[PDB]
Amino acid sequence: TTRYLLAKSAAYRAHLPAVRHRLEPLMERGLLARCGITDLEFGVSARSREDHRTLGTYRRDALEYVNTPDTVWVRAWEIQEALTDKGFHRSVKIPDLIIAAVAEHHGIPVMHYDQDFERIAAITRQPVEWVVAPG
Amino acid sequence: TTRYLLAKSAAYRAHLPAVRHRLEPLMERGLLARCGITDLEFGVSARSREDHRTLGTYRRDALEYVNTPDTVWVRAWEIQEALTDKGFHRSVKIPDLIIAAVAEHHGIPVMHYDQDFERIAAITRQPVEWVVAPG
Numbered sequence: 001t002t003r004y005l006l007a008k009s010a011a012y013r014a015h016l017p018a019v020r021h022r023l024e025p026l027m028e029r030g031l032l033a034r035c036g037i038t039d040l041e042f043g044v045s046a047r048s049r050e051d052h053r054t055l056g057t058y059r060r061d062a063l064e065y066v067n068t069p070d071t072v073w074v075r076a077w078e079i080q081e082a083l084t085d086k087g088f089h090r091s092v093k094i095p096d097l098i099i100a101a102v103a104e105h106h107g108i109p110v111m112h113y114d115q116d117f118e119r120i121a122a123i124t125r126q127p128v129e130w131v132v133a134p135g
Numbered sequence: 136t137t138r139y140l141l142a143k144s145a146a147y148r149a150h151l152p153a154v155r156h157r158l159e160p161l162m163e164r165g166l167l168a169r170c171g172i173t174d175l176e177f178g179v180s181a182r183s184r185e186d187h188r189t190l191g192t193y194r195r196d197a198l199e200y201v202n203t204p205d206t207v208w209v210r211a212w213e214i215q216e217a218l219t220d221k222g223f224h225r226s227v228k229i230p231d232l233i234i235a236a237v238a239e240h241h242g243i244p245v246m247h248y249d250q251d252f253e254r255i256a257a258i259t260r261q262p263v264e265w266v267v268a269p270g
Binding site: 043094 | 170171172174175176178179181183184186187188191202203205207208209211212215216217219220224225229230232
């Protein structure tokens with residue numbers, strides 16, 4: 001039904017059996033999504049220039065593209081402001097703010113393995129989901 | 136004449152006398168630029184929610200805005216690919232790729248204090264400048 005914007009923390013664990021068990025059916029159904037910044041974070045995992053090309057081909061084959069509206073910069077600033085008094089603005093990574101803003105714009109959950117997405121969602125009220133139960 | 140897109144590595148050193156000596160005249164002349172992502176990285180330095188607001192007001196008063204075109208995501212991916220064989224894709228931060236793409240789009244140098252901008256410029260041939268001589 002709804003797609004999930006897959007965050008690095010889950011993608012980098014796609015090889016673990018429980019995580020694969022969740023991600024493979026979503027992928028086969030076309031329910032995993034990517035955007036500009038999640039592709040960039042995925043590209044860090046390349047092991048050669050050609051492998052970076054292989055990874056790009058995989059991502060374009062396996063995850064549905066969603067656009068990044070130009071509102072993400074201010075939205076991320078708003079979220080960062082709301083995280084500041086608790087001090088989370090110094091630990092929540094800038095790319096994760098952008099990912100959250102993209103997912104919120106499209107009305108899709110972020111699928112992740114990082115409590116920081118729960119810290120963002122406490123502010124935005126947007127849907128987020130652990131790829132597998134954290135415990 | 137030309138503006139400079141100010142990167143975090145220089146902004147975070149604005150209090151050092153040599154750096155202030157370079158940045159204050161540029162600021163007074165309206166020659167320092169900001170974009171969505173450089174403002175986000177600056178916001179990490181806030182020391183309270185209200186201070187985050189103070190910092191935002193300062194940035195809007197002190198640095199000229201430039202837009203972030205939707206081409207930055209693919210441009211950053213291209214740069215990351217060209218950094219991959221040397222291994223720099225695993226150390227050059229995603230926000231710095233975006234900053235470089237913004238500056239390149241606008242034809243303005245990045246003003247920085249991080250050799251990673253020189254690694255990017257070796258690929259793109261775009262202008263970059265140390266805020267003060269690195270040595």
